[PDB]
Structures are given as structure tokens and as C-alpha cells.
Amino acid sequence: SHTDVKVPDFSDYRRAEVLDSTKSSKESSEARKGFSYLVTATTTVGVAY
Amino acid sequence: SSKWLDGFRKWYYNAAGFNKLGLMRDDTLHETEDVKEAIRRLPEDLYNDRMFRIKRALDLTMRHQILPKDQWTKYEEDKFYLEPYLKEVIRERKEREEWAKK
């Protein structure tokens, strides 16, 4: 059946604050994209220099 | 031929290294017109198995990984699924070429 399709566990690659399934998201998502966009912003500042 | 040629074939099969990507022998064949026609003549089950094995191999070579050793394709269990189809395509191409000669 199509209901036999189950997503495998991704917990080795998974980020730290999204590990437990019993905690809601949208509480630390802003921090995650703030980190990634800070990486992109620092890269853009360096190549602008 | 009896003692070590089969042993050297097993060692060369281990050494070539397509077994640790889960591939069979006939998955590794480079396409020509003959190989593409032989692939086109395959039934749906073997075609789908071949294409899944190929994209699994491409996934593994993306991450620079290999399969676990128990999932390596065994030398004896390696089936030559394509080569009767390829031999028939080669035979009919040779027939067409020898007719075009005369």
C-alpha cells in the first residue's frame, strides 16, 4: 500500500534543536535561518571587500 | 584454467570494484546503438531493476561511499541478464552488414 511508505530516521544529519519529535517547530526555526543567512552575509561581505 | 583462472576471475571481480556499488556486470556496459537496442528489448522488471541499480550507484558515487560488504554483488550470484539480447542485436546487425556488402 501507499500507507507502508514511512520516512526513515534522519537523526544523524539532523540539526540539534529539531531532534525530538515531541517539541514543536517554529520556536527555533528563526535561529536556524539566522545562522545560515549569517554565513551567507559574511561571505557576501568578504567578497564585497 | 581450472585452478587459478577462476580464482583470478574472482580476484579481478573484487578488484575492478563495480560490485561494491551494487552493480552487475552488464550495468557497466557503455551504450552503443547495439546496447541501447538491447536495453530497449528488455522486459519491464529487469529494466526497472537495472535503472534502480544505476541510480543507486550514482547516489553512492555522489557521497564517495560504497555499499556494506554483505551487500556487495557476489561473483557467482552475478547474472548476465543483458548479453543474450545484446548477442541477438549484434547478430542481426552483422546480418544486415553482410547483406549490404553483397
Binding site: - | 530497449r40 528489448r41 542481426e92 546480418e95 544486415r96 547483406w99
Partner: protein, 420 residues
């Protein structure tokens, strides 16, 4: 100087008939009782695909080899099919025709039926059905035979639109192994000797049982089909059950066919000695064509009236033809009309057996039906024995039967079966 046709019945049931024409060109056919008669609802359209797939690879000759070797010596390979039987034919020069039989026997005896090639020519099935259904007489006769019978003769010549893409090579293998058996074949040769034909029959043909599968007896159904498709002309066939091939009343039904009119004997004529054309010509003033339809099979026959008429004039054309047949069935006909009908029938037979294709088709038909070839003079003699009373009995057989109707066109004024 066309000395005598020789005939031979082998103990496995295979027929070999050959004639020594000493012709420049040789024609060799194989006649198999493997028509559309022998399909149930599980394998509809298998015979159409087998007819188209005769030129595929065989266990002994490839399709490239078959096509290039037939075209290399200039010979012709043809397959002719009806509901009852199929026929394979090769035409060539006498010096080459021997190896031509080799190709033919591969096509009959050892087909590989590779899956990719069958998947290739299912599109050829679709194209061939479209081309053959470009004529409206095809779909009229197809719907007429579908409605007129319950099983085993309602199966179409042309594959239904759902079975295209659903026929596999296993069904073709089953059809070959169950209907291309030894005692269902007649091997006919023109321009050859008996010895070579006996040799190739001993080589290729003598391996299968012979009885095969019988069929489902062709029970009569009746009814009508009306297909509104919007053309300028309306086609309507009204038939009823009639005697089969080999019955004593098939000759009377053919005489009644040629008495009521079965074709124009003069190009751009007015069909003076056609009774149906006379009645509709004195009735109407528009383009039309009315004729008598006869179709006799192994155990059944259909006889009736075919009408092509205008859209707003179909009722008077159909009623005029039907009342003409009703007036024939009461005994209102002359003896000279029956004599001219017999002349028309025997003239049509003699000009049908003149070419090598028609001659070999008649030999193969006689060998498959009766198992004993008769000369044309015997056929004309049993034509001459038909009395007019048997023609009146045939007309009363048509009138007092359950009719089957097939119609197509603008059916605003086309009548129904109870309204006739």
C-alpha cells in the same frame, strides 16, 4: 493443355492440391481455418494482429531476411482473411518460388513472436483499422455481423479499440498452436508439380495434432444497431438467416441475389434488370443504390437488402426495396428473369475464377470446405438445377425470419424493424 489439377489428402489431414500450369509465374498458397470465427471474448483482435504480424521474425528466418529476400526476387507475399479462414500466398518466378515456400512455411510453422516486435506493430493495427474503416460499408457489415450473431461470428475482423495495446505474444502463440494444426490446412500450388509440394509438406507441415479447437456454433441473435454519425448518405442493411455453404439452398439464395440485383453490369447504367433498383427508381428521384446481400458461411448464412439512400428519403427507399422482396416472395416473377439471374450468377463465377488469385482462392476454399475439388462445369451444372420454386422459398425464408438491421447516417427518417 492445362491438363488436370491433382489432389491429395495426407493421413494427418493436410490437403495438397496442385496444378501444372507450366506458367511463367508460380503462385503458392496455404489456407488455414484460423479466422476471426475462432476467438472468444478473451482474445479479441488476435487474428488481426497475426495477419499483420506475418512478416515478423521466425524460428529459421529473420524479418530482415524475409523482407529483403522476398523483395530481392521480386515476389509478393500476401495474407487474405475473412471471418472463416486465412490464406497466405507467395507469388514469384518458377526458378525462385521454391525458396519462396521456405519463407512462407516459416511464417506458418515456426513464428518466434518476439515481444518488442508485437509491441511495435500494435500501432500498425490502429492505422490499418482506421484505413479499412474509412469506407462505411466496412463498419455497416461489421456491426451487422455483430448484431446478427451471439457468439463466434459476432467477433470482428478488425481489433476493438480496447484490445489494442492489450494483445500479447502468448495469445498469438496460443492461436497458432490451437488453430494452425495439420488437419486445418490446404496447400495449393499453381505453376508447380506435386513432388516439390509433397516434399515441403513433409518437411515443415507434419507436426501438430490436427483437430484443434472447434468453436461456438454461431447462434443467431437478431436486433438492430443505429449509429448516428452525420454523413450525406444513409447506409442500411437488413438481413435474415439463410442456408450455409454446402446446403442445397445456397444456390437458390445466390440466384435470388442476382435476381434482385448484386452489381452494375454496365458502367454508368440504370440497372434495368435489377428489381430493387427498378422499384426505387420508379419511386425516388435522388441518388441511391440498392442491392441484395448474401454471405454464406460454414454453418450459417445471411441474406438481405443493402440500401444507400439520402437522409430524408431513407424510409421510402427501404420500404420500396422491402415491398419489392415481399412481392417476389408471393410468386410475382417471370421465368426469363430467373434465367437471366442464373446467367448473371454463372457468368460472375466464371469471371471470378479466371485470374490466378481467384482460381487459387476457389481451390483453397473448396479444399477447406468440402475436401474434394470440383470442376467449374459441375458448379454450373448444379447452378442450372435451381428451379424458381426454390427461389420463391428462399424469398419466403427471408420474409418470415427475424431480421437484423444495421444503419448509419442521419437517422431522422430511417425506419425501425417493427415499422417494416
Amino acid at each position: 493443355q492445362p491438363q488436370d489439377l491433382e489432389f491429395t489428402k495426407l493421413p494427418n489431414g493436410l490437403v495438397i492440391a496442385s496444378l501444372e500450369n507450366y506458367a511463367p509465374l508460380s503462385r503458392i498458397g496455404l489456407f488455414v481455418k484460423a479466422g476471426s470465427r475462432y476467438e472468444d471474448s478473451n482474445n479479441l483482435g488476435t487474428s488481426h494482429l497475426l495477419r499483420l504480424a506475418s512478416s515478423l521474425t521466425t524460428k529459421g528466418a529473420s524479418s530482415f531476411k524475409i523482407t529483403r529476400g522476398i523483395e530481392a526476387v521480386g515476389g509478393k507475399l500476401s495474407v487474405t482473411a475473412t471471418r472463416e479462414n486465412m490464406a497466405y500466398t507467395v507469388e514469384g518466378i518458377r526458378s525462385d518460388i521454391e525458396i519462396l515456400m521456405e519463407f512462407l512455411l516459416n511464417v506458418t510453422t515456426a513464428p518466434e513472436f518476439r515481444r518488442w516486435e508485437v509491441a511495435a506493430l500494435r500501432s500498425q493495427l490502429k492505422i490499418d483499422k482506421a484505413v479499412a474503416f474509412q469506407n462505411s460499408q466496412t463498419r455497416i457489415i461489421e456491426n451487422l455481423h455483430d448484431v446478427a450473431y451471439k457468439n463466434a461470428l459476432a467477433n470482428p475482423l478488425y481489433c476493438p479499440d480496447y484490445r489494442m495495446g492489450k494483445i500479447t505474444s502468448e495469445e498469438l502463440h496460443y492461436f497458432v498452436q490451437n488453430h494452425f494444426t495439420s488437419a486445418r490446412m490446404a496447400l495449393v500450388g499453381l505453376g508447380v508439380s506435386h513432388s516439390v509440394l509433397k516434399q515441403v509438406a513433409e518437411q515443415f507441415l507434419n507436426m501438430r495434432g490436427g483437430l484443434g479447437l472447434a468453436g461456438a456454433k454461431a447462434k443467431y441473435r437478431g436486433g438492430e444497431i443505429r449509429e448516428q454519425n452525420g454523413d450525406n448518405l444513409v447506409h442500411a442493411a437488413i438481413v435474415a438467416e439463410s442456408a450455409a455453404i454446402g446446403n442445397a439452398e445456397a444456390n437458390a439464395f445466390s440466384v435470388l441475389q442476382h435476381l434482385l440485383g448484386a452489381g452494375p453490369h454496365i458502367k454508368r447504367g440504370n440497372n434495368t434488370t435489377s428489381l430493387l433498383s427498378q422499384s426505387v427508381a420508379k419511386g425516388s428521384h435522388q441518388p441511391f443504390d440498392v442491392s441484395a446481400f448474401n454471405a454464406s458461411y460454414s454453418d450459417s448464412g445471411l441474406f438481405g437488402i443493402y440500401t444507400i439512400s439520402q437522409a430524408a428519403a431513407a424510409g421510402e427507399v427501404i420500404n420500396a426495396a422491402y415491398n419489392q422482396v415481399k412481392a417476389v416472395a408471393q410468386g410475382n416473377l417471370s421465368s426469363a428473369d430467373v434465367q437471366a439471374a442464373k446467367n448473371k450468377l454463372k457468368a460472375g463465377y466464371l469471371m471470378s475464377v479466371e485470374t490466378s488469385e481467384g482460381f487459387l482462392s476457389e481451390i483453397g476454399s473448396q479444399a477447406l470446405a468440402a475436401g474434394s475439388y470440383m470442376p467449374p462445369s459441375t458448379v454450373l451444372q448444379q447452378i442450372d438445377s435451381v428451379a424458381d420454386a426454390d427461389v420463391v422459398k428462399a424469398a419466403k425464408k427471408f420474409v418470415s425470419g427475424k431480421k437484423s438491421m444495421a444503419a448509419s447516417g442521419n437517422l431522422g427518417h430511417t425506419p425501425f424493424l417493427d415499422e417494416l
